[PDB]
Amino acid sequence: LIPPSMRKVLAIRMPETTMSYLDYFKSQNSGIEIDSIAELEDIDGAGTKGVLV
Amino acid sequence: IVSVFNHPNITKITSGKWIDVSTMKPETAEAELTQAIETIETITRGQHRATNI
Amino acid sequence: AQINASYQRDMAIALPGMVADTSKYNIDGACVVNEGDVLVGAAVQVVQAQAVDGHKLVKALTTGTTPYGVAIRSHWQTVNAQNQMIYEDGGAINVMTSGRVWMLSKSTEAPTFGSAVKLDVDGQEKSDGTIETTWTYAGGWTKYKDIQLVEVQLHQL
């Protein structure tokens, strides 16, 4: 579960060989489901983001 | 009668010139388009998503 | 492909001039607006109390007058004016003499719990208002959009 702002970070493509980092990550880590929720952007009430695995 | 570009309560984003003097910047366009797509949904909280550019 | 997104938004706590809680409260009818208009989240004054009929003439607070109650939000009696909820000249008003209510505020600092409530000349809560009132704060301090609201506990006069 990632914040819905880093969703644009995993959308950058691979160094040179097209496709996004997300495609490679899912190809080599099959089975894991990735989703985003908006409650992971103000964890401490001061503007700290977080990811839960 | 108010035009499309002069409505008071709409989101306006100032931009860095996509073509400065004569040099053209093809990497700011993608960033600005992604940011504009994001704002709409984030603000509308998921009811409305961008469809046209 | 893409990552799904889910958002979350919380509702506002309260609106101006509404009953805050279900504690012991008293709302007095048979009150007619003698002159002018009265805002929902504002105090009132008693111009005259009829000796035989029973109606009480109410009016907005002015300089050097003791407050008596606070108007209450209602979707039937009130009339929409200036994009707000208001009571017009004539008709009946709903003023509560005892209980808790959210009131319009002009102060910018959160108040304490057991301190007396001071009002300005126009009947709105203010930290340094000239008018002194026996009512005390209740601790509620919220803001709806651009309107500041404060919770105040009232006692019967």
CSV table of N, CA and C in Angstrom, one decimal, chain A residues 7 22-23 34-38, chain C residues 1-8:
chain,number,residue,atom,x,y,z
A,7,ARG,N,2.8,7.1,-7.0
A,7,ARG,CA,2.3,6.3,-8.1
A,7,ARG,C,2.9,6.8,-9.4
A,22,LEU,N,7.4,-0.5,-12.8
A,22,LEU,CA,6.3,-1.3,-12.3
A,22,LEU,C,6.2,-2.6,-13.0
A,23,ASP,N,6.4,-2.6,-14.4
A,23,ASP,CA,6.3,-3.8,-15.1
A,23,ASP,C,7.3,-4.8,-14.8
A,34,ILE,N,-0.4,-4.6,-5.7
A,34,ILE,CA,-0.1,-3.2,-5.3
A,34,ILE,C,-1.3,-2.3,-5.4
A,35,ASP,N,-1.5,-1.5,-4.4
A,35,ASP,CA,-2.7,-0.6,-4.3
A,35,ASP,C,-2.3,0.6,-3.6
A,36,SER,N,-3.1,1.7,-3.7
A,36,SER,CA,-2.8,3.0,-3.1
A,36,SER,C,-4.0,3.4,-2.3
A,37,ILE,N,-3.7,4.0,-1.1
A,37,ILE,CA,-4.8,4.5,-0.3
A,37,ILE,C,-4.3,5.9,0.2
A,38,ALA,N,-5.3,6.8,0.4
A,38,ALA,CA,-5.0,8.2,0.7
A,38,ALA,C,-4.7,8.4,2.2
C,1,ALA,N,0.3,-2.1,-15.3
C,1,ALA,CA,-0.7,-1.3,-15.9
C,1,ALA,C,-1.0,0.0,-15.2
C,2,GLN,N,-1.8,-0.1,-14.1
C,2,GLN,CA,-2.1,1.1,-13.3
C,2,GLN,C,-2.4,0.6,-11.9
C,3,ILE,N,-2.3,1.6,-11.0
C,3,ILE,CA,-2.5,1.3,-9.5
C,3,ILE,C,-3.8,2.1,-9.2
C,4,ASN,N,-4.7,1.3,-8.6
C,4,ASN,CA,-6.0,1.9,-8.1
C,4,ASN,C,-5.8,2.9,-7.0
C,5,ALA,N,-6.7,3.8,-6.8
C,5,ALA,CA,-6.6,4.8,-5.7
C,5,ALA,C,-7.9,4.9,-5.0
C,6,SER,N,-7.8,5.2,-3.7
C,6,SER,CA,-8.9,5.3,-2.8
C,6,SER,C,-8.7,6.5,-1.9
C,7,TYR,N,-9.7,7.4,-1.8
C,7,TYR,CA,-9.6,8.7,-1.1
C,7,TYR,C,-10.5,8.6,0.2
C,8,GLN,N,-10.3,9.6,1.0
C,8,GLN,CA,-11.0,9.7,2.3
C,8,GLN,C,-11.2,11.2,2.7
